[PDB]
Structure 1
Amino acid sequence: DRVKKLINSQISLLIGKGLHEFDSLRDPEVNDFRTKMRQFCEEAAAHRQQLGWVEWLQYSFPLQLEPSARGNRALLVNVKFEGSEESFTFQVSTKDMPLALMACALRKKATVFRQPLVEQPEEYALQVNGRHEYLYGNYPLCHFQYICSCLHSGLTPHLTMVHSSSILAMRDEQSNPASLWSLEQPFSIELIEGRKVNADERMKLVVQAGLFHGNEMLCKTVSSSEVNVCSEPVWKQRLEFDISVCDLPRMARLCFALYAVVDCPIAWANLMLFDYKDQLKTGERCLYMWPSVLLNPAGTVRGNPNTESAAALVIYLPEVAPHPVYFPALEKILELGRHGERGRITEEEQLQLREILERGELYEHEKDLVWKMRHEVQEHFPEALARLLLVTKWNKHEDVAQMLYLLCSWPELPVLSALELLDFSFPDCYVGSFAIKSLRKLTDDELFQYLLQLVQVLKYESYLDCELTKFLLGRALANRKIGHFLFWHLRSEMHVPSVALRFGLIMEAYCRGSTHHMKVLMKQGEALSKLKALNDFVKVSSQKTTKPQTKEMMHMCMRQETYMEALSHLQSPLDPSTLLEEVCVEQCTFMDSKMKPLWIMYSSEEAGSAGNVGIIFKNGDDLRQDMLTLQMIQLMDVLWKQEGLDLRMTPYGCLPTGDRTGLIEVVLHSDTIANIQLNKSNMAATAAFNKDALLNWLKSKNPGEALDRAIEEFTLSCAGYCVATYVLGIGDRHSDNIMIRESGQLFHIDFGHFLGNRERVPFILTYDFVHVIQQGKTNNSEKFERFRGYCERAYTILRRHGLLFLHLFALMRAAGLPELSCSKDIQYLKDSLALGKTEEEALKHFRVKFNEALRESWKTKVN
């Protein structure tokens, strides 16, 4: 009642769109989605409210494990009990399970409190101090990201013994409140007129139209007559396509493009021929067009919401029957496709078929063999499904039904095959559903790794109520970390009108399933809102006065009650495990770059040294490419680690949150190469030669025996970053966008240009880094060639996963990133990974590239 109303207003402020606007559309598809998804999400909320206490830890604090541990040494740990002022430090082994550490902690408590305890270690979980992170399960301590991280930095793990009753009180606190195949006539539409058309009066107006099944044409494109340029052009002409109404596939889309001719692009618009209830569309349609930047089949199938300014093409869909006509039900489809001729071929053609199914464009005769032998593709080459789907004639209902019959008894495919099938090249809904079925086996860790791409896929969907939305919602409601990033990936695109309805509707549905998480995300939004206002202040102030003056005023503004309250005690949007507790106003500042990004520091007494975390708030730039590049660098690190190779990478968080707005994770104890190379006097790193500065800095940060492992960290990370930047074509690399951690770890920042952006980016070897790798010596081939080996190993591991990078980048094309919009961009990846060559041919080629980069480094070594 009063709560229903509050939650509704809270969801509205959270998603950045009033719920009343969904009702105002009076759209039955929108109303059905809201009803269906609200129900689906409320069932997940009820399922969760009754979860066991370990299951509720699996939901809220999913395990953060080392990639090499998915599916021996002395260790010092500090353990306290919940709300106890006293802790206990004790030696454990890296091979010990959390349970042994717990039994240890419980025996200590029994002896200090002089009483034999009722408690068993099974009734407890271990929280990482001041973090929404927990250690539980039968995994050795070294398998946990937190422990493993503490071991490299030499830090002592700090853990809190949390009872099951405490966890069950968290679960209770966070509770939700109380017949077409008959119609043989050619496809046709009436092109009535246009409205609000703005163009050069010297020219004429033409409407190009085409029927598509994804990006493939179903027939040849057709064009209207040339009508004189005016605000309201009138055609009233029938456009006739070469394709029977019975041949129209379920996912057929009618695409329009309006242009001015003497070409000159003005606008475009698409629509689905069948609705969400499978009915073949009849009557008049007003298409509110999107301004063009020749047809756009990949474009959205919903009209431009800016009705007041947008051009509108009025069309008529004919009543080809006196009663409604729905697309045949699956039972009628299987009944038609059931009957086929099983292909029988020679042993010679059997080797030729094997050759092409294991080989990727084909010749016509090669496509006919695949289609002839489709039954054998199902039985002996099921991973060749995508190649089979590409030869299927989508403009012939008899061929489509035969394809669908084989697909409905097709064995589930590996995750890598299923990711390829979500591409827009496979637009059929049954293929789409099959691809989601083979993706249900994804682990939460795999799903997390590919979520950004699966959210981009939502922009290729033709209808709101889809298998991918239910799958993303179900997985979001089952894992709080998936939930968090699903929300932010959707929320960050609400300023984009083509997606605002889809995205707003999914977030509302999500909020229905988690009232508590909605309130938690609102706290995140309240902090971001304040940051925007604070950053606006800084942008204006930085142009009018000195930096000490702007920094002081920034501080006074932060010191206001409203600011101190909104900016404190929130989960980080960059990582929900990270708690941003007390903002340290004195340690906050801003950068000197164009957008004057804010540098916000936090502290947490409960987390200790681990609670000292920073975020960078940046407003003015599109942060989506930075996020993608960094996610690709993190994926590389995961693949390398799975082959036992740790190149000591720094894939720091980067998250868009709003319109040209986002956060970047601060890596503390790091400085740019440019700052270190300044070679300021009265510093511990002051050098005799500028080439010594970076090694002297490493020396002051790592005294005595520590220097040796810092040079190794630098070498390892340098090899990984040399490989990452080359493979991804990261260019415009200089001293101010390369950083170094005190540990020796090198890392890259500011990924605004990738995939060659257009020039093939050569491999880069910088003399200042070769100097450190060589331990400051002129000649140190032992050290240098050990670095080349790290580079080669890293490169050949990525190649073996080349299809994964290709599949994920192809899915990203949906995002609309200016540097990832066609085949030219994916070609850079195919080239840089040398995927068309053998491992020997590719490795030899990488060596030609690495050697060319060494001779280039020698042009600076000569001086």
Structure 2
Amino acid sequence: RVKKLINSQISLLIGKGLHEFDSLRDPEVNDFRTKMRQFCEEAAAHRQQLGWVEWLQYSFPLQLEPSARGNRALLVNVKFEGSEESFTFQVSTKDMPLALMACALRKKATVFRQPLVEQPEEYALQVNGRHEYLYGNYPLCHFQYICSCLHSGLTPHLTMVHSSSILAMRDEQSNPASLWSLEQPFSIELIEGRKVNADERMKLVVQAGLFHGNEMLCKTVSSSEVNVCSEPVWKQRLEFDISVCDLPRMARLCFALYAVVDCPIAWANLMLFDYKDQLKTGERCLYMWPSLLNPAGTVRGNPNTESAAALVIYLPEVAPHPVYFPALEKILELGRHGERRITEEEQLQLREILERGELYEHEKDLVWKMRHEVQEHFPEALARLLLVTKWNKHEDVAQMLYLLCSWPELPVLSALELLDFSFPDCYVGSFAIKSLRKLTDDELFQYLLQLVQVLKYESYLDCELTKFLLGRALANRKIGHFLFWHLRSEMHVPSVALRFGLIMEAYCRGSTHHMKVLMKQGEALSKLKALNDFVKVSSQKTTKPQTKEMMHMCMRQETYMEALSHLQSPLDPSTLLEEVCVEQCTFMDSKMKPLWIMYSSEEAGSAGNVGIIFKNGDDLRQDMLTLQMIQLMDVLWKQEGLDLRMTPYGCLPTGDRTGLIEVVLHSDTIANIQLNKSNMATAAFNKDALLNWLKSKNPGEALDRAIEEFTLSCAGYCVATYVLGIGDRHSDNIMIRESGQLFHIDFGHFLGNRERVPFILTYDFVHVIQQGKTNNSEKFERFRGYCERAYTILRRHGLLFLHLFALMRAAGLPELSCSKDIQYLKDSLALGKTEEEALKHFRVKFNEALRESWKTKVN
């Protein structure tokens, strides 16, 4: 009764009926579902018995300041859960939550004239009207919430929540109750093709290659030219220059059907061994993807069989019995035997190339020969060694694996490199995952987007990365929340819909309660899509105030009021979207008419006043990636004591060309501010407009802080947009907060898009930095130091950006497709240079931007 209901809820939530999984009659799919359902149910059972503080860590993970990861007076308002009464008292930013709780309990004991049985140790502090809590031994300023309150001048509002109330939360959210002997050359039979569409004047060719990730295992082989028709017949043997015994475990056979007089038509790939390590034999009908060879492409066929071109091949029965890939112990027994001492002049050449990339043929022979010295004295150079390993020789792969199986754990930075498609071996991926287990939940969340993209490179459904991601998502509700949405937003992509659908179902088995919370979000998103469609049509016939009044009426319907109210925000599960403020809702006049949905919450006070933007028609993945990169910059800067007052607002794709963007309230575009309308708080010179607007928002002594906020954030965005190559910057996509913080929006073009984006300096912004003065080198040169400091901090982490962007090539974003896009980051970060050379080059670029800025000052 309940299992049937849950299955129907999973189907609606993931956007694909579970019956469709069953209908594939696919053993691999069935074994994934069984194994992962069991793995996720164990996680759920472990969670239901967690202690009350451990359950707060699961459900409300701490939001700490980046500097606090791994003195001053403060007013705080504290209430108790079943109370309207509140106590405002002064604490120190260095006090711990326990002291604040003990203080609140003394105030409650004297007001209620009774000495209390409850100890401060029995409570946690909830941020009012948010799924956010303050707990643990950390000073108040170490929490992101208190730190945020400190800068914005607002008073923290906290609610004392008792352990029994937290346990009541935990309880109501419960789940219900031998190859190496086969020396023959590898070969296949190209039988025939189906549903082929091509120019009848041309001829058809099938090119085939053997790959181990990016590297070709042997030379490619082509079929003979056969006349173009819908059902081509070849019925010919294709033989490769590699012995069957040497095919590595992760070998893939890649096809490309094209037309010749070049006209690409289709591609299809497959793993030579199955998920149970057995070499494949018999016929295979390969349903091809429309387009020369595509090795990174998926190894599962095109699901649109009704119209996909197919390629029938035959994998020969190389043995009278099934052949399985050797078990690890047999590989290790073979690799155990090898040879290790060569010249100090050869040793010195190894230290130069390992601390240097690309290298010559003789240097590969030197790195391979000294592989034991690589393991012992340069363990972090494992990736260079794996690249020199000849993956087409089964005995060199066995020696690489013997060293790998005793390789010391590498740092997270090194592991993120190893997840790249250039390291397709399963043991290498397993080693990379083992070195990633030490990632904190905060580091994991920072890199989650890249780890999800790595799933598209996985050759098999059940893998160490999926289990690692599912285990982390079930142990942290915020990780779980975003893993769900990163997968859900790609269900319209046929190449990932099965893998992603299966991960989402398995996660759902682990948290029935969270599945229901996510349904409530999908219901709101469903209604927002209908509302945006209504707005796009109505905006073409009537005026903006009429379409807005019609939008409000459609929102005031009972179905909309229920669907859109009392939900956790997809942008941030800590943010509660309570009462939709229909009157404050609106839409932008851009082509897709994005909706601006406003919310309030009595419980949360001013912090419950939040906005979300529903956007349908544009792809939001590039915006999300850019905004995550700016947030990563902000974390790296704050880790060095540098706060550039950045505004990395939320952006989350949720569906096909659909997603949400977090509203930053009290913000306006530079264009609106520069409109210089009359009867407002009105410049003599348009250059005075931003500064006058800052003055009206920050009177008296507050102007100085607003100018400083502007300066810091301007330096941060100047460096961020330059490093990332964000172009097409104009007054309509640069915003300013009433606090003075400048920020950028609308990141549809990055990494040059394809020119080399120069460093930018705007006169109107220089004018604010210079406090409205023509000459103010004191304030201007403080700003130049903020820029150089920010830039030099990012260069020190250049490899982190490079590794993350390399993992993102799997996303298929058009402006991040090849090594040419990664080159842009190398050039902007000047990674081939020393710090002095790169600082000299940054100074030349900043000075160039100043002379260009002066072409406006001169006018």
Does the TM-score normalized on the shorter chain lie above 0.5?
Answer: yes
1:639 Cα shift?
A: 0.1
- Distance, in Å, in 1 between the alignment partners of 2:819 and 2:7 is 44
- Distance, in Å, in 2 between the alignment partners of 1:581 and 1:756 is 41
- Distance, in Å, in 2 between the alignment partners of 1:780 and 1:728 is 29
- Distance, in Å, in 1 between the alignment partners of 2:620 and 2:606 is 29
1:492 Cα shift?
A: 0.1
- Distance, in Å, in 1 between the alignment partners of 2:351 and 2:706 is 51
Q: How does 1:278-293 map to 2 (within 5 A)?
A: 278-292=277-291
Q: CA deviation digits over 1:609-634, x for unaligned, max 9?
A: 00000000000000000000000000
- Distance, in Å, in 2 between the alignment partners of 1:315 and 1:251 is 20
1:17 Cα shift?
A: 0.2
Q: CA deviation digits over 1:538-589, x for unaligned, max 9?
A: 0000001101110000000000000000000000000000000000000000
- Distance, in Å, in 1 between the alignment partners of 2:250 and 2:300 is 14
Q: CA deviation digits over 1:843-862, x for unaligned, max 9?
A: 00000100000000000000
- Distance, in Å, in 2 between the alignment partners of 1:466 and 1:61 is 28
- Distance, in Å, in 2 between the alignment partners of 1:575 and 1:71 is 23
1:345 Cα shift?
A: 1.3
The aligned counterpart of 2:175 is: 176
Secondary structure of the residue aligned to 1:238 is: strand
1:346 Cα shift?
A: 1.1
1:384 Cα shift?
A: 0.4
- Distance, in Å, in 2 between the alignment partners of 1:278 and 1:766 is 60
Q: CA deviation digits over 1:792-824, x for unaligned, max 9?
A: 000000000000000000000000000000000
- Distance, in Å, in 1 between the alignment partners of 2:774 and 2:8 is 68
Q: CA deviation digits over 1:649-676, x for unaligned, max 9?
A: 0000000000000000000000000000
The aligned counterpart of 1:655 is: 652
- Distance, in Å, in 2 between the alignment partners of 1:748 and 1:415 is 30
- Distance, in Å, in 1 between the alignment partners of 2:445 and 2:745 is 23
The aligned counterpart of 1:530 is: 527
Establish whether residue 466 from structure 1 lines up as the match of residue 463 from structure 2. yes
Q: CA deviation digits over 1:422-476, x for unaligned, max 9?
A: 0000000000000000000000000000000000000000000000000000000
1:220 Cα shift?
A: 0.4
1:691 Cα shift?
A: 0.2
- Distance, in Å, in 1 between the alignment partners of 2:69 and 2:75 is 24
Q: CA deviation digits over 1:166-223, x for unaligned, max 9?
A: 0000000000000000000000000000000000000000000000000110000000
Secondary structure of the residue aligned to 1:499 is: helix
- Distance, in Å, in 2 between the alignment partners of 1:116 and 1:556 is 54
1:347 Cα shift?
A: 1.2
Q: CA deviation digits over 1:371-423, x for unaligned, max 9?
A: 00000100010000000000000000000000000000000000000000000
Secondary structure of the residue aligned to 1:209 is: strand
Q: CA deviation digits over 1:287-326, x for unaligned, max 9?
A: 000000x100000000000000000000000000000000
- Distance, in Å, in 2 between the alignment partners of 1:228 and 1:71 is 65
Secondary structure of the residue aligned to 1:127 is: strand
- Distance, in Å, in 2 between the alignment partners of 1:388 and 1:347 is 20
Structure 1 residue ranges (4+ consecutive) displaced by more than 6 angstroms after TM superposition:
none
1:746 Cα shift?
A: 0.1
- Distance, in Å, in 2 between the alignment partners of 1:423 and 1:762 is 30
- Distance, in Å, in 2 between the alignment partners of 1:232 and 1:31 is 33
Establish whether residue 390 from structure 1 lines up as the match of residue 387 from structure 2. yes
- Distance, in Å, in 2 between the alignment partners of 1:636 and 1:629 is 11
- Distance, in Å, in 1 between the alignment partners of 2:447 and 2:232 is 46
Establish whether residue 829 from structure 1 lines up as the match of residue 825 from structure 2. yes
- Distance, in Å, in 2 between the alignment partners of 1:349 and 1:405 is 24
- Distance, in Å, in 2 between the alignment partners of 1:475 and 1:632 is 22
Secondary structure of the residue aligned to 2:238 is: strand
Q: CA deviation digits over 1:675-694, x for unaligned, max 9?
A: 000000000x4000000000
Q: CA deviation digits over 1:473-515, x for unaligned, max 9?
A: 0000000000000000000000000000000000000000000
- Distance, in Å, in 2 between the alignment partners of 1:404 and 1:680 is 70
- Distance, in Å, in 1 between the alignment partners of 2:262 and 2:659 is 39
- Distance, in Å, in 2 between the alignment partners of 1:212 and 1:348 is 36
1:348 Cα shift?
A: 1.2
Over aligned residue pairs, what C-alpha RMSD do you find?
Answer: 0.3
1:71 Cα shift?
A: 1.4
- Distance, in Å, in 2 between the alignment partners of 1:69 and 1:91 is 23
- Distance, in Å, in 2 between the alignment partners of 1:664 and 1:247 is 51
1:718 Cα shift?
A: 0.1
- Distance, in Å, in 2 between the alignment partners of 1:116 and 1:67 is 39
- Distance, in Å, in 2 between the alignment partners of 1:185 and 1:657 is 50
Q: CA deviation digits over 1:71-94, x for unaligned, max 9?
A: 100000000000201000000000
Q: CA deviation digits over 1:718-745, x for unaligned, max 9?
A: 0000000000000000000000000000
Establish whether residue 816 from structure 1 lines up as the match of residue 812 from structure 2. yes
- Distance, in Å, in 2 between the alignment partners of 1:362 and 1:502 is 37
- Distance, in Å, in 2 between the alignment partners of 1:525 and 1:434 is 37
Q: CA deviation digits over 1:219-276, x for unaligned, max 9?
A: 0000000000000000000000000000000000000000000010100000000000
- Distance, in Å, in 1 between the alignment partners of 2:854 and 2:109 is 67
- Distance, in Å, in 2 between the alignment partners of 1:433 and 1:471 is 10
1:132 Cα shift?
A: 0.0
The aligned counterpart of 1:271 is: 270
1:516 Cα shift?
A: 0.1
Q: CA deviation digits over 1:131-185, x for unaligned, max 9?
A: 0000000000000000000000000000000000000000000000000000000
- Distance, in Å, in 1 between the alignment partners of 2:219 and 2:43 is 47
- Distance, in Å, in 2 between the alignment partners of 1:178 and 1:768 is 64
1:351 Cα shift?
A: 1.1
The aligned counterpart of 1:334 is: 332
The aligned counterpart of 1:750 is: 746
Aligned length: 859
- Distance, in Å, in 1 between the alignment partners of 2:845 and 2:87 is 55
Secondary structure of the residue aligned to 2:254 is: strand
- Distance, in Å, in 2 between the alignment partners of 1:413 and 1:83 is 50
1:769 Cα shift?
A: 0.2
- Distance, in Å, in 2 between the alignment partners of 1:353 and 1:396 is 23
Percent identity among equivalent residues?
A: 100
1:703 Cα shift?
A: 0.2
Secondary structure of the residue aligned to 2:234 is: strand
The aligned counterpart of 1:498 is: 495
- Distance, in Å, in 2 between the alignment partners of 1:718 and 1:506 is 41
Secondary structure of the residue aligned to 1:704 is: coil
Residue 734 of structure 1: which of 727, 730, 733 is its match? 730
Q: CA deviation digits over 1:334-384, x for unaligned, max 9?
A: 000000000x11111111101111111110110101100000100010000
Q: How does 1:322-471 map to 2 (within 5 A)?
A: 322-342=320-340, 344-471=341-468
1:332 Cα shift?
A: 0.3
- Distance, in Å, in 2 between the alignment partners of 1:738 and 1:415 is 35
Secondary structure of the residue aligned to 2:43 is: helix
- Distance, in Å, in 2 between the alignment partners of 1:352 and 1:535 is 63
1:115 Cα shift?
A: 0.5
1:95 Cα shift?
A: 0.3
- Distance, in Å, in 2 between the alignment partners of 1:608 and 1:582 is 12
- Distance, in Å, in 1 between the alignment partners of 2:488 and 2:551 is 27
Secondary structure of the residue aligned to 1:646 is: coil
Establish whether residue 4 from structure 1 lines up as the match of residue 20 from structure 2. no
Q: CA deviation digits over 1:99-155, x for unaligned, max 9?
A: 000000000011000001000000000000000000000000000000000000000
Secondary structure of the residue aligned to 1:315 is: strand
The aligned counterpart of 1:668 is: 665
The aligned counterpart of 2:205 is: 206
The aligned counterpart of 1:801 is: 797
The aligned counterpart of 1:792 is: 788
Q: CA deviation digits over 1:686-713, x for unaligned, max 9?
A: 0000000000000000000000000000
- Distance, in Å, in 2 between the alignment partners of 1:749 and 1:834 is 26
